[PDB]
């Protein structure tokens, strides 16, 4: 996907998680997020260091998303949603820098 | 793309990395691999179509790609450091993970 | 020590790393693993006793430890960077290599 | 001073930045936050990677406070106010791990 | 502490490093230097007592320690890798910062 | 080249970096600064023409560029990681070395 | 083994390789070396950075030994012996520093 | 100057250090070697990791020449003479790879 979709996806599903009731909604939104992050982490100069640093921010995000999913799969719902709110830290870090 | 199609990409770009002289060929291959592994991570394989998406088998299948993706990330990182021979080695080790998933769900 | 004895050490210290809280426990375990893998690299396993030391099987057996040793080196490196959770993950992935050699020569 | 007293100064002054109106209270409050954070960056061993890690946390924190002061000093108060809120990320990140 | 004694601390340790044999010594010295630099950041030097805490000279004085701190950190890092010589030489480049500030505000 | 023009090159690029937006700019500037510094290493400045090539002042003059070079390298590295701000600020700390040498031999 | 043995081994087998006739003598001496390096790379403070840097020198050595063995296993004898002579570079690097 | 001319200066001056008697020829020859090596450190792309790698090679080489001069400057001629011989390691290492 287009990077803009990847952001729609991440942003949309962040909201879903916040509003979510049960664990199946959380797992499902985070899965969507994980994939968007993975796709955004791979795209089409031999490659600038701002590219390297950009890609790296997605890689962090993925790992964090992945931790959160793990909590949701363990059944810890409360804990998962908090991690999702903690992701914002990384979202804005990037946006500050590259936007 | 298709789960089959992803496996193709992985396998071609594995061979590209064996036969690669220079570091650009290897980044380029590994990146095409990562993209393929990312797409595959969401796929649902034949043998597990009858299973729940939440089944331990589907969990485990997803985990194999999570692993594979980390191994490509780690190999990428080497190729950036210009460590061609290392990155080709880290790539050859992927086959273990390829095989372990195949053994179980192919 | 004995090839069997090495496999013990590996397996105990694999479990230590699963249950480890702090980073010192994990370095300490991984180091005991490395030492064991190093000793094993020269060992000659039962199933291959009839083979030439220069046989492709013995080559391949040695290669599995060479691989395993690199994976412990790489996991060690993470534990030094204080990246406990990563190093425990890199450790769990060893099992693939444990298993691939076992499949063939155990 | 005491590490308890560092964390209090951090927390309190973070609140004062939330509440502040003009650049000078923000400049002042951050200046205090910085001191506490430099103090801080200084059963487990002295050499242990948990301490390399712990210290490195405050190194991040300091860089972030320095930036937020640089904004305050320029007169971008609002932008400084936000830089400050996002510090929490690092606070928590340490807390999650070592609180 | 006495701004003066922070400076005693910086100067003493500068020399310690200069004749240190091993890294553990160097880290320790640098770590004391960092502590001193941190405490120094807040101080008003006698030449600026008359001046506004906001004065451009106080900003410049503060910024001098900020540079100093950074350099100490960069030298610490060279020490943790065990590049003793490289740490020792970083630590000698600090003298430029010492001197620049001193030339303007001592 | 003209020692003077090396210094023109160092000064021009110092400013380039100062107002660069992206990293590719910064690397380029730093790389020119390195080239200039290298060529400068061999030069005799007018104030030392009278002196022995072995003279302690020529050693000290040479050593000033050696420091400078190192700092350029350390700033280059911050640039290749894409820490633009950090590179830009390293590059401002070079001014201390510029000034120290100038104060003594210009 | 004692580090002194590890050195006897490495030194003894370097000489053997130099004097070697056939590929089986080279493979065999390098194998002995590889093992000595591996053992020296693992031994019995939370751990000094000079220790880290020391261990690292062995790790380089192993990788080099391993390349050389590979050439010998391919049949390239001449090439292997040269690599063994190239190892000295690493041997002395360490000795300079730590001895 | 030309990169061919760098490598010649390096090689020739390396020979002059082998042959030298007093500190001044060693000091001089290395001084020349250093210049050539600083020149050098400066179909594949500009940004490529092969060039990061190539350059980094000469960075090593320079550090080694600097050390060997520092010995020469102290009057440890013999020790400088050996520091010089061991440079070959780096020469070859580059050569093996990029000659
Ligand atoms: C960089 C490493 C990023 C991370 C991590 C995240 N985002 Fe992002 N985001 C990034 C860029 C460069 C852009 C601008 C590109 C463009 O033109 O679209 C964005 C943009 C957004 C947007 C709005 C863009 C749009 O579609 O019009 C949103 C809503 C957004 N990003 C949300 C978002 C969330 C929720 C993230 C984490 C959970 C996140 N982003 C991470 C770069 C990066
Ligand atoms: C699971 C977690 C897998 C990992 C990791 C890898 N592969 Fe795979 N692969 C997997 C499945 C379930 C299948 C069957 C697909 C189907 O619908 O039939 C495959 C298939 C392949 C194939 C064959 C495709 C075909 O032509 O039928 C190849 C060539 C292949 N896989 C290669 C491959 C490589 C090289 C991998 C890692 C480097 C790899 N796979 C990982 C499941 C999984
Ligand atoms: C080959 C290259 C191997 C690798 C890598 C690992 N192991 Fe292994 N293991 C191997 C063999 C040939 C054998 C049989 C030994 C015998 O003489 O009987 C083993 C055996 C074990 C055992 C069982 C020992 C016993 O009680 O009989 C265990 C528990 C074991 N191995 C564990 C293990 C682990 C945890 C590894 C990696 C992390 C590992 N092995 C790697 C060959 C190889
Ligand atoms: C580590 C790298 C930390 C960072 C960065 C921050 N904090 Fe912290 N904090 C840390 C520890 C280990 C502790 C426990 C200390 C104790 O003895 O309790 C704390 C504690 C606090 C507290 C509670 C202390 C109390 O008196 O009860 C607060 C209020 C606190 N921390 C706030 C805080 C803020 C606001 C931070 C960033 C802006 C922050 N901390 C960062 C470790 C670390
Ligand atoms: C400003 C940004 C400074 C930096 C950086 C350093 N120093 Fe300093 N130093 C500074 C001042 C204003 C003074 C005068 C203090 C006073 O109260 O009169 C000093 C003083 C010293 C002294 C003399 C100390 C004494 O006991 O009288 C020393 C020996 C000294 N400073 C050393 C020093 C070193 C070694 C530095 C860097 C490594 C350094 N200073 C930095 C202001 C600043
Ligand atoms: C000694 C070790 C030096 C260092 C480090 C730097 N410079 Fe320099 N510079 C030096 C000398 C001896 C001279 C005089 C040259 C002459 O022939 O008279 C200079 C001169 C300059 C000048 C003026 C250049 C001109 O065209 O007249 C500038 C602008 C200059 N130097 C800048 C400069 C910068 C920006 C440096 C570091 C980044 C720097 N110099 C270092 C000796 C030394
Ligand atoms: C450090 C990372 C080393 C590498 C790589 C190599 N050697 Fe070494 N060696 C090292 C040390 C610290 C010592 C002294 C320790 C002691 O007291 O023994 C040595 C010593 C030797 C010796 C003599 C020691 C003895 O047994 O009396 C020899 C002959 C020797 N080393 C040879 C050698 C060779 C051939 C190497 C590479 C092929 C090599 N060493 C690497 C540290 C390190
Ligand atoms: C890379 C990082 C290098 C280092 C370090 C050294 N050399 Fe080099 N050298 C290098 C290259 C890519 C080439 C090929 C250049 C060409 O156009 O041929 C060379 C070449 C030489 C040559 C031959 C050039 C000729 O005119 O035929 C010599 C004699 C030479 N190099 C010597 C040399 C010495 C003595 C070095 C260290 C002390 C050294 N080189 C280091 C790349 C690199
Ligand atoms: Ca859309
Ligand atoms: Ca609802
Ligand atoms: Ca698809
Ligand atoms: Ca098929
Ligand atoms: Ca044994
Ligand atoms: Ca048994
Ligand atoms: Ca304190
Ligand atoms: Ca006093
Ligand atoms: Ca001493
Ligand atoms: Ca001119
Ligand atoms: Ca501009
Ligand atoms: Ca013996
Ligand atoms: Ca013979
Ligand atoms: Ca040139």
Swiss-Prot record, chains D, H:
Function comment: Electron-transport protein of unknown function.
Stretches with biased composition (Basic and acidic residues): 43-53
GO biological process: electron transport chain
GO cellular component term, pick one: periplasmic space
Keywords: Electron transport, Heme, Iron, Metal-binding, Periplasm, Signal, Transport
Section covered of the full-length record: 23 to 128 of 128
Key word RNA-binding present: no
Region spans: Disordered: 38-53
Entry annotated with the keyword tRNA processing: no
Source taxon at top rank: Bacteria
Protein localization: Periplasm
GO molecular function: electron transfer activity; heme binding; iron ion binding
Cofactor note: Binds 1 heme b (iron(II)-protoporphyrin IX) group per molecule.
Cofactor: heme b
Record's protein name: Soluble cytochrome b562
Assembly and interaction partners: Monomer.
Source organism of this protein record: Escherichia coli
Predominant cellular place of this UniProt entry's protein: periplasm
Binding-site list for heme b: 7, 95
Family, as annotated: Belongs to the cytochrome b562 family.
